[PDB]
Design a protein around this ligand. Structure first.
Ligand SMILES: *[C@@H]1O[C@H](CO)[C@@H](O[C@@H]2O[C@H](CO)[C@@H](O[C@@H]3O[C@H](CO[C@H]4O[C@H](CO[C@H]5O[C@H](CO)[C@@H](O)[C@H](O)[C@@H]5O)[C@@H](O)[C@H](O)[C@@H]4O)[C@@H](O)[C@H](O[C@H]4O[C@H](CO)[C@@H](O)[C@H](O)[C@@H]4O)[C@@H]3O)[C@H](O)[C@H]2NC(C)=O)[C@H](O)[C@H]1NC(C)=O
Ligand SMILES: *[C@@H]1O[C@H](CO)[C@@H](O[C@@H]2O[C@H](CO)[C@@H](O[C@@H]3O[C@H](CO[C@H]4O[C@H](CO)[C@@H](O)[C@H](O)[C@@H]4O)[C@@H](O)[C@H](O[C@H]4O[C@H](CO)[C@@H](O)[C@H](O)[C@@H]4O)[C@@H]3O)[C@H](O)[C@H]2NC(C)=O)[C@H](O)[C@H]1NC(C)=O
Ligand SMILES: CCCCCCCCCCCCCCCCCC(=O)OC[C@H](COP(=O)([O-])OCC[N+](C)(C)C)OC(=O)CCCCCCCCCCCCCCCCC
Ligand SMILES: CCCCCCCCCCCCCCCCCC(=O)OC[C@H](COP(=O)([O-])OCC[N+](C)(C)C)OC(=O)CCCCCCCCCCCCCCCCC
Ligand SMILES: CCCCCCCCCCCCCCCCCC(=O)OC[C@H](COP(=O)([O-])OCC[N+](C)(C)C)OC(=O)CCCCCCCCCCCCCCCCC
Ligand SMILES: CC(C)CCC[C@@H](C)[C@H]1CC[C@H]2[C@@H]3CC=C4C[C@@H](O)CC[C@]4(C)[C@H]3CC[C@]12C
Ligand SMILES: CC(C)CCC[C@@H](C)[C@H]1CC[C@H]2[C@@H]3CC=C4C[C@@H](O)CC[C@]4(C)[C@H]3CC[C@]12C
Ligand SMILES: CC(C)CCC[C@@H](C)[C@H]1CC[C@H]2[C@@H]3CC=C4C[C@@H](O)CC[C@]4(C)[C@H]3CC[C@]12C
Ligand SMILES: [Mn+2]
Ligand code: NA
Ligand code: NA
Ligand code: NA
Ligand code: NA
Lengths: 36, 291, 995
């Protein structure tokens, strides 16, 4: 009922999930034992 | 001196004439195409927003309580005896109120006569060109009690009784909602018109509240607030000469030669506050009549 | 020098006067068997390793302080200190303050911490790799223990140990000579004179330095062999203390430092200029008195590549590691770059181009060519083993020989056993031992009276033996050597047993046989003997080897023996790469010109179609002296001709010939060739293994000492050590050296792009009077996020596809940072990266209510804190913080957009000539950097509290995709530019954009 309200929590958690995924994948690549 | 100019191959600052011409032409065509791509992307973005409706507004919600005269550091200090120490506030008040002059609201194709008492939201329709330009609810300058620039041009500063006209931040498609009297147990005693957004000024500490004096609220119908019959706002494209509701507060009987900080607050469901934004729904003005 | 002869000759006290018995009871060593490994370890643990104590090492925790509180770290600490100081002022002024300055100071301090921690990681890695090479192949010492002779690390030599040194070995420690056979030492580093002083066990002088029975540490043994006993080890030796307290090296201006220090100075100057100019600009634009200095600090930190030192360190250390893994050990780090600039390689034939594994192949006697060496079927050879001439040939091939099989090897095959002697002598041994009989038995029967070994002056081997036959004259002389010299020293030739005068027809057949055997690429040796008359030489005759008591002329030629020596496997492809890389290969061998030419044509030094003057003359049957020398692109220069050659003739031969082969060239003449090549303005790498090569190895730009057969003198005089003695390894090292230039250039070209988008927002802020699109905190975010890890990741990039298909570079033309690199980083890529950020800024402001046109001039009121009536394009009124939220969200989106375009910049910086599709994304560290920078941006934009601490607010989804077009634009632009360069070499596009 609040048109002047954007669900900032949804985008925030979406971006944080992405940040965690990218961080984990980066660690997997740099610490990879079989990616070379 | 060799780097500055060598004439053998006609090199100036490092390269020959043909070199300068070639790099200048490359940079001209490159920067031209770059600025063209920038402008093109800007136009493609412009084709997404509309002329009378912004794609995002949660950054202006809730609106802010603004005060006239606007003051640097929000301090209204002057010497009532000296007519010069308060000329700045008078100039600002006159410049803002001139848009509300009795002569400014002449034509009826723009200005429409709205009720002398606060009424319900006068919904003009939708935000398109189908209904063309829109009507403007007139606001009589006389609705301000003793500060109208009609009988006393000074507005009170001449005899140590200033006036700070309060105003609400214009927000497109905003419908103020006064608090229901059922919930009325927190805010102080005020007149209750279900079509009036209330505003109440007080001190801030146990010292300013005492040294303040006697508040005098002036507004449409004698209600300390804004009448709901002036909202919603339809933007600057549909209502070019829209006049927003005003309200005045006169601080009669203020402690001379003493600075007192007062906070005015607009209550309502749609009106929030913030500890970081000292103007979101409320505001602060410290006044000192040092005569 | 105030450090030598009178001060050193007095610090001396030795035991050269002791007898072998007194020496034995003093040191307690079995003078014929050495000490037991038990006592060796005991003395090693008691006295310490045979090494000199090194200077102190900076603590493992001091680099942290030197980096965290260094040059730019001091600037960031000053900024954070000022922020904390202003927070104290605000905590003392009006009650109910704000903590903006506390968070700004915490931010700056965290920036210093992260920057110093990353730089420390990189520098600690540099230390970890620098140590890995000083002990990769340590210097060895040949000691004798428990009777067995074993080679051990020089640091494990203890006092009393008996060491055995030979020609080319370094003296492991001060020794007392017990036994020696013609041993000569080079006391140049000790007394100054490089004249070889002989060393004998006999006591000759009271002064320890003037005596002849003491070998000194750090000196080298030139010729001979000697056994001694360690009297001083480590720091106790004569030269030990002197050399370590006076051997400080220089501060050599390597081209890497020559370019890096300069470019860093200019970039630091322009950055500090921008910082102060923006400082005064901000102060004029009513900026707060503290945020102006913070903006100056941020500008200085961002516009300066504060990781170029780490990038250079990682590049040089990584490529040094890569070279060491490919059998190229660099002694110093200058060679790491000189290798990439190599243009001429003077290599040897035997030892570097070939495996030096010789096997007898053909013989020439009785005017007939005889193949031999049956395939282990007990058949022997392809001729009768009873031929008289072959008997005389194998007789002098086993008698005049000097190599012997080692202990316990007469119970296994002959082509799989071990030997002791030259490669040629080993092949001559394995031949007659596999097809005639026992060489030890034959050499025992013909007792050797006197012998002349292989000397550089004689240039031939010889031996006189007692003859036990019946139709035998008492003494039989046998000699071998260069076939030409052996033929000139003979009057008769042995034909089927009967000798006959050496006529012209036989000499012509000999020359034709030499051409036949040498055309196959085989080393040929001459053999001859003489039956010394009894009237002139009775039984008890004593042949003088110093006055030529016996005749050396009028000999009798027996035959020619030729051995095969296959070239290395990767040599042909290596010379092919060199030809494809503009590197001139020159063969410098002491072999015969026929064999040298054959081997060169086989491995590709002399390519098909090219002919020497001799080949032209032989093709059109004209005198060689008549042919035009310019008609031959290749040539075979003889050593005797180089001796009678002038500097101008040498320069002529080198300048007007593309394929040069120096045959019969002595190791001393190598320096002449090196000087001639350097005189032509070329970087020369020269291969050396002997002690006579030292001048040529030190004079050359890159001396390559053989890692296996190379003596310690060559290894100590060389700039690089070839671990597998393979020529192809030199070319591989050259490619690795060429890789550092590309990687460093790419990393530099990537680090400079972000400066334009980091400074343009403030410039437009002043010129256009619009709300600031990029703040200080976000500038620091851009620097820490996209400029640290992605810039280092370029150092790990692999070689391109045309790394060896291009031409070498010279220092005075190919600079690290040139005008084209600045134009590309600042004028083309940087501008697009900045435009992307400006675009997303306009998008955010327009979507929130402020159209781009409305933003002109609005900044005056936008930055005002008391004007809360700011009207947008839609006519709405905003407060101060309400609009500041949008401005800071624009800052965050600007940072995100910069990351997005930095993706494309990092990808296009992977290749500067080829396309990214041929190279591929094989770099794992680069992909890691991309993922981590994107994750860091997402975290700094969506983590709770970032809005109230770093003023960074969440980004709406449709805001991440606003910079994609500019990123793709950068990608396609660089791809088409590189495609145009590839399909139009030397064109305008390359001559103006190829950085
Ligand atoms: C701000 O707005 C307010 C309204 O919101 C104005 O209100 C005024 O407040 C005062 C204080 O309460 C009232 O009381 C007294 O006013 C006296 C003067 O008025 C007397 O005469 C009037 C009749 O004549 C007046 O009106 C006609 C038009 O009708 C004019 O033509 C004529 O010239 C006169 O102006 C009567 O109607 C009125 O009741 C009075 O009899 C003051 O003299 C009086 O002072 C006494 O009280 C003081 C304490 O307050 C004390 O210090 C004095 O010693 C003395 O004992 C008192 O102020 C006003 O009636 C009321 N209206 C008006 C029109 O003034 C207020 O005026 C305005 N601010 C200013 C600065 O004007
Ligand atoms: C409305 O506003 C006023 C403030 O102005 C408040 O009441 C008083 O108003 C006067 C007038 O401005 C103030 O100033 C002067 O105070 C002097 C002090 O003397 C008396 O007061 C002290 C306490 O301060 C006593 O201890 C002492 O014994 C004295 O009795 C007076 O001498 C002044 O008198 C002069 O002015 C009056 C009218 O202005 C004339 O008629 C006289 O002839 C004389 O010239 C004057 O009173 C005073 O300080 C104010 N008192 C305060 C602030 O406490 C009202 O309180 C305020 N209304 C409300 C509802 O709060
Ligand atoms: C009004 C405000 C204007 C602000 C302008 C701000 C410009 C900021 C740029 C800063 C970075 C400068 C970095 C220099 C790095 C040099 C590194 C180095 O040693 O390189 C060797 C290289 C040289 O390499 P080389 O020596 O190997 O090659 C030499 C080649 N020949 C012989 C042909 C010359 O250095 C350079 O090329 C120096 C280039 C300097 C360029 C200076 C450009 C100033 C232009 C300003 C434009 C202002 C436009 C205003 C428009 C307003 C419109 C309204
Ligand atoms: C406005 C619209 C813009 C659209 C832009 C994109 C257009 C094209 C569509 C996709 C392109 C982008 C994805 C490319 C993937 C390429 C993969 C690859 O290995 O290509 C191999 C190929 C090489 O293939 P190859 O090496 O197997 O084959 C070579 C064969 N020979 C040897 C014969 C030549 O190289 C590339 O295409 C490089 C692409 C690099 C793209 C880098 C993008 C940034 C990378 C990471 C950023 C962060 C991502 C975070 C993701 C988080 C997800 C939750
Ligand atoms: C109606 C049509 C709609 C099309 C929509 C888009 C479809 C996807 C478009 C591109 C994605 C696939 C790109 C493949 C590129 C070549 C890969 C390759 O391995 O070739 C090897 C060849 C190299 O082979 P090689 O011979 O050099 O390597 C030899 C390997 N050995 C030694 C083993 C034999 O690649 C090249 O030479 C590359 C030239 C590239 C020039 C690129 C110019 C344009 C810039 C970017 C391209 C577009 C990016 C996407 C844009 C999207 C826009 C929406
Ligand atoms: C290989 C290259 C070209 C592709 C780069 C990957 C792109 C598609 C990734 C990189 C960062 C990502 C964003 C990270 C965070 C958010 C917040 C979330 O609530 C919506 C999606 C959104 C906006 C993501 C969309 C996908 C995204 C833009
Ligand atoms: C950031 C803003 C204020 C300045 C940007 C101005 C642009 C036009 C500047 C930035 C870097 C500059 C280039 C830097 C170096 C060279 C080499 C010189 O021999 C020819 C001009 C040329 C190619 C410059 C042309 C102008 C240039 C492209
Ligand atoms: C280089 C150019 C020509 C590529 C052509 C495609 C252009 C027109 C496309 C590519 C990516 C697109 C942008 C992607 C995301 C956004 C966010 C949205 O809320 C406004 C439009 C905007 C900004 C788009 C505008 C159109 C756009 C810029
Ligand atoms: Mn040699
Ligand atoms: Na930087
Ligand atoms: Na050298
Ligand atoms: Na970059
Ligand atoms: Na930068």
């Amino acid at each position: 009922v609040d048109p002047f309200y954007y669900d900032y929590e949804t985008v925030r958690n979406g971006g944080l999930i992405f940040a965690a995924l990218a961080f984990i994948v980066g660690l997997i690549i740099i610490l990879s034992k079989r990616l070379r | 001196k060799k780097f500055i100019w060598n004439s053998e191959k006609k090199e100036f600052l490092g390269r020959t004439g043909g070199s300068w011409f070639k790099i200048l032409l490359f940079y001209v065509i490159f920067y031209g195409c770059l600025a063209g791509i920038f402008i093109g992307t800007i136009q493609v973005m412009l084709l997404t927003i509309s002329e009378f409706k912004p794609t995002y507004q949660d950054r202006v919600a809730p609106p802010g309580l603004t005060q006239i005269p606007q003051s640097q550091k929000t301090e209204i200090s002057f010497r009532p005896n000296d007519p010069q120490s308060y000329e700045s506030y008078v100039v600002s008040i006159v410049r803002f109120l001139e848009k509300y002059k009795d002569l400014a609201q002449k034509d009826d194709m723009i200005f429409e006569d709205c009720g002398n008492v606060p009424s319900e939201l006068k919904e003009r329709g939708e935000y398109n060109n189908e209904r063309g330009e829109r009507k403007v609810c007139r606001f009589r300058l006389e609705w301000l009690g003793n500060c109208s620039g009609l009988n006393d041009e000074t507005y009170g500063y001449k005899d140590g009784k200033p006036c700070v006209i309060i105003k609400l931040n214009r927000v497109l498609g905003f419908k103020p909602k006064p608090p229901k009297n059922e919930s009325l147990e927190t805010y102080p005693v005020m007149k209750y018109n279900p079509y009036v957004l209330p505003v109440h000024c007080t001190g801030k500490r146990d010292e300013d509240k005492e040294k303040v004096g006697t508040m005098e609220y002036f507004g449409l119908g004698g209600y300390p607030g804004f009448p709901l019959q002036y909202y919603p706002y339809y933007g600057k494209l549909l209502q070019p000469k829209y006049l927003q509701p005003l309200m005045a507060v006169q601080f009669t009987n203020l402690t001379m030669d003493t600075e007192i900080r007062i906070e005015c607050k607009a209550y309502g469901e749609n009106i929030g506050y913030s500890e970081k934004d000292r103007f979101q729904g409320r505001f602060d003005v410290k006044i000192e009549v040092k005569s | 020098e105030r450090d030598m002869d009178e001060l050193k000759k007095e610090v001396s006290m030795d035991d050269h006067k002791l007898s072998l018995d007194e020496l034995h009871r003093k040191y307690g060593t079995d003078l014929s068997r050495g000490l037991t490994p038990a006592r060796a370890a005991e003395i090693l643990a008691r006295d310490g390793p045979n090494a000199l104590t090194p200077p102190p090492t900076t603590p493992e925790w001091v680099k942290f302080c030197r980096q965290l509180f260094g040059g730019f770290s001091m600037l960031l600490w000053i900024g954070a200190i000022l922020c904390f100081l202003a927070y104290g002022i605000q905590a003392a002024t009006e009650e109910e303050p704000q903590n903006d300055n506390l968070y700004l100071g915490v931010v700056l301090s965290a920036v210093v911490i992260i920057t110093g921690c990353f730089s420390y990681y990189q520098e600690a890695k540099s230390s970890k790799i620098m140590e890995s090479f000083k002990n990769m192949v340590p210097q060895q010492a040949l000691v004798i223990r428990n009777g067995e002779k074993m080679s051990i690390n020089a640091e494990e030599v203890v006092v009393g140990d008996l060491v055995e040194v030979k020609g080319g070995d370094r003296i492991p420690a001060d020794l007392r000579i017990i036994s020696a056979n013609g041993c000569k030492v080079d006391n140049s580093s000790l007394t100054g004179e490089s004249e070889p002083q002989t060393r004998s066990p006999d006591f000759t002088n009271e002064n320890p330095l003037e005596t002849r029975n003491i070998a000194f540490f750090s000196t080298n043994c030139v010729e001979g062999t000697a056994r001694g006993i360690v009297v001083y080890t480590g720091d106790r030796t004569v030269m030990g203390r002197i050399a370590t307290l006076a051997s400080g090296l220089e501060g050599g201006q390597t081209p890497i430092a020559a370019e890096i220090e300069h470019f860093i100075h200019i970039i630091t100057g322009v950055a500090v200029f921008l910082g102060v100019s923006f400082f005064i600009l901000s102060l004029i634009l009513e900026y707060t008195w503290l945020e102006a200095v913070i903006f100056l600090i941020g500008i200085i930190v961002a516009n300066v590549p504060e990781g170029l030192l780490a990038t250079v360190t990682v590049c040089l250390t990584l490529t040094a590691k890569r070279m060491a893994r490919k059998n190229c050990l660099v002694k110093n780090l200058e060679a790491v770059e000189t290798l990439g600039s190599t243009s001429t390689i003077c290599s040897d034939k035997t030892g570097t181009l070939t495996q030096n594994r010789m096997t007898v192949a053909h013989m020439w006697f009785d005017n007939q060519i005889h193949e031999a060496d049956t395939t282990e079927n007990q058949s022997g050879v392809s001729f009768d083993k009873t031929s008289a001439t072959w008997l005389a040939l194998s007789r002098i091939a086993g008698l005049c020989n000097r190599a012997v099989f080692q202990a316990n090897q007469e119970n296994l095959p002959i082509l799989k056993r071990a030997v002791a002697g030259d490669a040629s002598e080993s092949a001559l041994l394995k031949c007659i031992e596999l097809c005639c009989g026992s060489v030890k038995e034959m050499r025992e029967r013909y007792t050797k009276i006197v012998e002349i070994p292989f000397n550089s002056t004689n240039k031939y081997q010889l031996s006189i033996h007692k003859n036990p036959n019946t139709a035998e004259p008492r003494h039989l002389l046998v000699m071998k050597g260069a076939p030409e010299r052996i033929l000139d020293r003979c009057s008769s030739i042995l034909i089927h047993g009967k000798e006959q005068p050496l006529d012209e027809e036989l000499k012509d057949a000999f020359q034709n046989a030499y051409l036949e055997l040498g055309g196959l690429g085989e080393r040929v040796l001459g053999f001859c003997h003489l039956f010394l008359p009894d009237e002139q030489f009775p039984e008890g005759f004593q042949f003088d080897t110093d006055d030529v008591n016996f005749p050396l002329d009028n000999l009798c030629f027996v035959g020619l023996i030729s051995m095969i020596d296959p070239p290395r496997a990767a040599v042909p492809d290596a010379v092919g790469k060199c030809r494809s890389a503009g590197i001139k290969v020159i063969m410098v061998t002491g072999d015969h010109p026929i064999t040298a030419k054959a081997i060169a044509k086989g491995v590709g030094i002399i390519s098909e179609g090219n002919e020497t003057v001799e080949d032209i003359a032989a093709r059109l049957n004209i005198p060689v002296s008549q042919v035009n020398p310019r008609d031959a692109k290749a040539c075979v220069v003889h050593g005797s001709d180089l001796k009678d050659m002038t500097s101008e003739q040498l320069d002529d031969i080198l300048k007007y010939h593309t394929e040069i082969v120096f045959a019969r060239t002595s190791p001393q003449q190598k320096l002449i060739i090196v000087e001639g090549c350097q005189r032509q303005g070329a970087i020369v790498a020269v291969t050396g293994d002997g002690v006579n090569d030292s001048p040529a190895l030190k004079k050359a730009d890159i001396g390559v000492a053989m890692g296996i057969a190379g003596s310690d003198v060559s290894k100590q005089a060389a700039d690089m050590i070839l671990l597998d003695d393979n020529f192809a390894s030199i070319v591989t090292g050259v490619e690795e050296g060429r890789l550092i230039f590309d990687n460093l250039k790419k990393s530099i070209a990537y680090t400079l792009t972000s400066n334009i988008p980091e400074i343009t927002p403030f410039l437009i802020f002043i010129i256009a009077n619009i709300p600031l699109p990029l703040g200080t905190v976000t500038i620091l975010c851009i620097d820490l996020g996209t400029d640290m890890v992605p810039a280092i990741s370029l150092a790990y990039e692999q070689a391109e596809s045309d790394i060896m298909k291009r031409q070498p570079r010279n220092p005075k033309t190919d600079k690290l940072v040139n005008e084209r690199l600045i134009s590309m980083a600042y004028g083309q890529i940087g501008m697009i990266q900045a435009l992307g950020g400006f675009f997303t800024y306009f998008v955010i402001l327009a979507e929130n209510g402020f159209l781009p046109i409305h933003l002109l001039g609005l900044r005056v009121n936008w930055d005002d804190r008391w004007i809360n009536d700011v009207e947008d394009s839609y006519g709405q009124q905003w407060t101060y913080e309400q609009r500041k939220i949008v401005e800071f969200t624009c800052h965050t989106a600007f940072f995100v957009s910069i990351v997005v375009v930095q993706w494309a910049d990092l990808v296009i910086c992977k290749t500067r000539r080829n396309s990214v599709f041929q190279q591929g994304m094989k770099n794992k560290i680069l992909i890691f950097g991309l993922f981590e920078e994107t994750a860091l941006a997402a975290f700094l934009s969506y983590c709770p509290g970032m809005g109230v601490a770093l003023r960074m607010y969440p980004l709406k989804p449709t805001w991440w995709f606003c910079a994609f077009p500019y990123s793709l634009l950068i990608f396609v632009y660089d791809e088409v530019r590189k495609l145009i360069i590839r399909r139009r070499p030397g064109g305008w596009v390359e001559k103006e954009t190829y950085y």
